[PDB]
Design an enzyme around this catalytic site. Sequence first.
Site, PDB file in Angstrom:
ATOM      1  N   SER A  54     -13.893 -48.038 -21.198  1.00 18.10           N
ATOM      2  CA  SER A  54     -14.075 -47.279 -19.963  1.00 18.10           C
ATOM      3  C   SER A  54     -12.922 -47.644 -18.982  1.00 18.10           C
ATOM      4  CB  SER A  54     -15.444 -47.572 -19.360  1.00 18.10           C
ATOM      5  OG  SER A  54     -15.526 -48.951 -18.960  1.00 18.10           O
ATOM      6  N   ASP A  62     -14.288 -52.481 -22.726  1.00 17.55           N
ATOM      7  CA  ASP A  62     -15.113 -51.622 -23.579  1.00 17.55           C
ATOM      8  C   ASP A  62     -14.495 -50.218 -23.744  1.00 17.55           C
ATOM      9  OD1 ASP A  62     -15.578 -50.404 -21.084  1.00 17.55           O
ATOM     10  OD2 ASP A  62     -17.743 -50.209 -21.385  1.00 17.55           O
ATOM     11  N   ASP A 100     -29.058 -47.671  -6.945  1.00 19.71           N
ATOM     12  CA  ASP A 100     -29.673 -47.622  -8.305  1.00 19.71           C
ATOM     13  C   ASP A 100     -30.538 -48.852  -8.704  1.00 19.71           C
ATOM     14  OD1 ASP A 100     -28.059 -49.555  -9.298  1.00 19.71           O
ATOM     15  OD2 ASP A 100     -26.876 -48.210 -10.587  1.00 19.71           O
ATOM     16  N   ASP A 137     -11.937 -47.860 -14.566  1.00 25.87           N
ATOM     17  CA  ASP A 137     -12.430 -47.836 -13.214  1.00 25.87           C
ATOM     18  C   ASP A 137     -11.367 -47.080 -12.385  1.00 25.87           C
ATOM     19  OD1 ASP A 137     -14.503 -49.564 -13.995  1.00 25.87           O
ATOM     20  OD2 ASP A 137     -13.556 -51.213 -12.928  1.00 25.87           O
ATOM     21  N   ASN A 150     -16.619 -46.746 -12.448  1.00 28.97           N
ATOM     22  CA  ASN A 150     -16.448 -46.812 -13.861  1.00 28.97           C
ATOM     23  C   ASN A 150     -16.868 -45.581 -14.566  1.00 28.97           C
ATOM     24  OD1 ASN A 150     -16.610 -47.745 -16.494  1.00 28.97           O
ATOM     25  ND2 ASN A 150     -17.543 -49.649 -16.015  1.00 28.97           N
ATOM     26  N   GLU A 158     -11.276 -54.524  -4.891  1.00 29.76           N
ATOM     27  CA  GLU A 158     -11.298 -53.592  -6.030  1.00 29.76           C
ATOM     28  C   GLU A 158      -9.947 -52.884  -6.208  1.00 29.76           C
ATOM     29  OE1 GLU A 158     -13.334 -53.538  -8.276  1.00 29.76           O
ATOM     30  OE2 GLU A 158     -15.298 -54.197  -7.565  1.00 29.76           O
ATOM     31  N   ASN A 186     -11.192 -51.122 -18.722  1.00 25.81           N
ATOM     32  CA  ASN A 186     -12.139 -52.186 -19.027  1.00 25.81           C
ATOM     33  C   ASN A 186     -12.075 -52.482 -20.529  1.00 25.81           C
ATOM     34  OD1 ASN A 186     -14.310 -50.327 -16.915  1.00 25.81           O
ATOM     35  ND2 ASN A 186     -13.241 -52.217 -16.329  1.00 25.81           N
TER      36      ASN A 186
END
EC number: 3.2.1.17
Length: 129
Positions: free
Chosen positions: A50, A48, A101, A52, A59, A35, A46
């Site tokens: 967003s 979209d 989650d 990270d 994110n 990462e 990203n």
Amino acid sequence: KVFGRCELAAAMKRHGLDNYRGYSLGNWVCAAKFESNFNTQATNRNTDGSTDYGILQINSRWWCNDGRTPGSRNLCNIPCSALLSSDITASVNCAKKIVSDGNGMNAWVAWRNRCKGTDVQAWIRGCRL
Ligand SMILES: [Cl-]
Ligand SMILES: [Cl-]
Ligand SMILES: [Cl-]
Ligand code: NA
């Protein structure tokens, strides 16, 4: 801060990640390597809109507020900048929420594609833990 491999493994263990939701320490170290290359200051945009952040590339779409990701949530209740600290505490605590989650570590696509099913224990080989 760019952590050493065993340095980061020690810090993650201290913070409760070793077998957290069943994921051995080497999973976490492997995810961090791919990462962020162990760099707490890593950021990546990203598609979209967003971003990270940090050693585990958390994110802004769901987990932290950066003030520039429309429609997003801040489920860890932190500024995304806290994820860039030399102290990993905020990353670790938010990671615990993520991995809990429903999808386990598959939330980290780099984990699923590069660590999952591999000999992850190699990531902590030689470390004093
Ligand atoms: Cl392991
Ligand atoms: Cl926002
Ligand atoms: Cl799981
Ligand atoms: Na957000």
